[model samples]
Target: ALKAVLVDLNGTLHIAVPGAQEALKRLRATSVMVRFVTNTTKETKKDLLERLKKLEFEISEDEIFTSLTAARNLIEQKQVRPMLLLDDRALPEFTGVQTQDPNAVVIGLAPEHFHYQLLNQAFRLLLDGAPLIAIHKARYYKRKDGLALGPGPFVTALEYATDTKAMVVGKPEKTFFLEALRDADCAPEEAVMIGDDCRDDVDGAQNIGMLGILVKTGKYKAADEEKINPPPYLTCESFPHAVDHILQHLL
Candidate 1:
């Protein structure tokens, strides 16, 4: 039986998905602990929570985790002076961190600021031996318009330009998954990760020994569901159906 549920926010719970509110109500009605996780660095946790509330998702600030928050934790604990490359909306999350003459370069998605001048500055720092850290390097992301390039392309560019590797600090990273489970007092085997993206949301969790479920919403593609190596524990048309499957079987 499951002890905890780790669900994705953007694609699986809201945005393009339906029945998330009611499904969350049903899931929360049970004894299972719930935590929402995301790799989105476009917005701060406060703004992310607000969007969820506006969509009528029943979530608490503490019950959510973002790559931005996780990266900040590492930055703060290590006391690294970080040169932040993030969205203006996401910059607020790094309020207390120092960035002057950084010893580390933290990169995230900021659509407007990825120009040559800014990137070159970060590149120069990497050449000076500053470590590169990324929130997430997702290749592409779902958008209302269509699939758009994510930070991965730019992150890759910097990697290629500086000949430096980036430490990814978000979903698909084993430690990030463990951190979430650690707080829930749950083991990997006793937890389930419900998300949409095949790589980050599905395979990532499964690779860490947590059951992964795929929902056909948000970044999901018909081909993505079929392309994963070990396959999803189950696939659903939407988030509510995934919850139904869990209630019927895994839980």
Candidate 2:
């Protein structure tokens, strides 16, 4: 039986998928544990939580797992002082991390901070053998206007320039999924992940032996299902539909 459900936030929850709030309430009524996960590097956890609250999503900070958390964990474990290329709002998350004479380059979604001079500085550090840590490598993400470039291109550029393979700490990384599952105390097979991005969210979970449900909301293209080799366990119209399917069939 499904013991836990990992839901994506940006496209799945943040974009106001119809009936999502009610679906979450319904899911909360069940015994299965729920976790909201994201690769968003634009905002700190506190800010993200506030945004969700403003949207009336009824999510608590503890229930949300972000890639920033994973990145911070990796940085701490490696004991590397990092030059963080992140949004200004996200800096607070790494308040205690040392940044002087950085030994590592941690890259995230920092559009304003991605200028040539800063990137060259990071490149110089990588040339000196500093490890590159990528929060995530999502090619693009949804915006209210349209799809916008994500941090992936920049990360890839650095990788190409420095000939260094970055250590990724976000979606599609096995450790990330496991970390999220750790709190629920459940095996991968006993959990399911629902999200909009087919590759990162769905395939990422499925790769770890968990079921993945792809929702056709937020950054979802019709051809996404064909891109993955075993595809999504199920593709629903929205988050609420995915929840309904989980409650009725998976449980």
Candidate 3:
């Protein structure tokens, strides 16, 4: 088996009945290191962690990698103290912010959960010289609740309002995957990404030459699979099937 496998939660793992705890346990038995690589634009790492815990999946916070974490790292690395635009309930993701005179701005989906005041405040920050950044450019996602527009459209709205192109840091973007690599002590060749989104996760992995495995659980339509520039290495019926194919090829 490879040193590790990167898994997407929302569409693939999260679709596993009762939160995929059993699948995780089964995978763990094979001694294949599993690291979650995902975008959680609607929630903070802490909130999502708690949600995972309540679902009874025993995983360390470190075991999970998020696009938000990648975005924060970029802000610090770029020396851009940013004005954050995330869910008000998910503000714990920011944890601490000492100054309002931020050098940059960041945003994600906080819809049900958004406030006009927050939007104006973030917009004002852009006015005050803060450059914008986003976790992902996904226009929408298929959720258990229903279809929802992701941060991409929201970012576009601000781009129209601010006439600025916000820096983005996830999926189709290299930096996000790199952050996970830095954390896992692995190379792109040693990694493979599995998810249900064709355009984002599948092609995104292929962009870096990391193997891509598409699961048929949630969002992806087999007919629409042809849209991606270069197709995934293997398209499987389920995560277990992907695991079988992965080990078969690797072995």
Candidate 4:
């Protein structure tokens, strides 16, 4: 029987539409346990939270984990304050932060809406002293139309110019999953990680002893479809389908 489920938000939660919240409500009612493990590099915590709520997924900050939060936790553990290189609008999540200003800049995802002005400012801050921090260094995130250069590209540019390495915080890195497991005190065997990112979620979790499941949303592609083998313990057409399988196994 399954004891807990750690889900990916962007893909597994919904198809990036209104249907996501309704589907989330279904998963919530199953009454086992749920947590959203998101790979968002650029979206501020508030924006992510609000989007979830707007989708009608009744959730809270504790129920959700972001790369930024994971990055912050690691930096805090190191006892170093970081100079944040994230969205300026996101500064509020660090409320009452007396911690060390990030040793320089911690950069993450930036969708098309992200501005070069922000990049220029981050460069200046790096000049002023700030080390780069990132979670997943994914080169790009898939969108409806096509691909757009993601945070990693920007981070690489920063590295080329500033010579600071980004201390990554999320998947394939193993921090987010480990922290989530620690938070719930659940063994890796007792939990399953479901998402659309094969390398970040599948290969990464397999390295840690947890089961990894893949879905066909967000960034899924047909060319590399065989990658799911060696096998994922299980795979489904989508999150709702995966839920059905989980409920069957849970009972």
Candidate 4 at residue 57, lDDT?
75
The residue pairs that clash in candidate 2, if any, are: none
- lDDT comparing candidate 3 with the true structure: 0.74
Q: 19-79, model 4: which lDDT tens digit per residue?
A: 5555667767776677788766556667877887876778887777767678767766766
Summing lDDT over every window of 10 consecutive residues in candidate 2, give the lowest-scoring window. Answer: 39-48
lDDT of 2 by residue, 97-209 (tens): 99999999999999997899999999999999999999888889888999999999999999999888998889988867887887888999999999999999999999999
Q: Evaluate candidate 2 by giving its C-alpha RMSD to the native, one decimal.
A: 2.9
Whole-model lDDT values for every prediction: 0.86, 0.90, 0.74, 0.70
Q: Write the candidate numbers in order of decreasing TM-score.
A: 1, 2, 3, 4
> Estimated TM-score per prediction?
0.84, 0.84, 0.79, 0.74
RMSD of each: 2.9, 2.9, 3.6, 4.5
TM-score winner, 3 or 4? 3
Highest lDDT: which candidate?
2
Order of models, best lDDT first: 2, 1, 3, 4
The residue-by-residue lDDT of candidate 1 on 107-157, one tens digit each, is 888788789999999899899888888988888988999999899999999
Worst 10 residues of 4 by lDDT: 95-104
Q: List where candidate 1 sits over 4 angstroms from the true fold.
A: 16-18, 138-150
Task: Pick the winner on lDDT between candidates 1 and 4.
Answer: 1
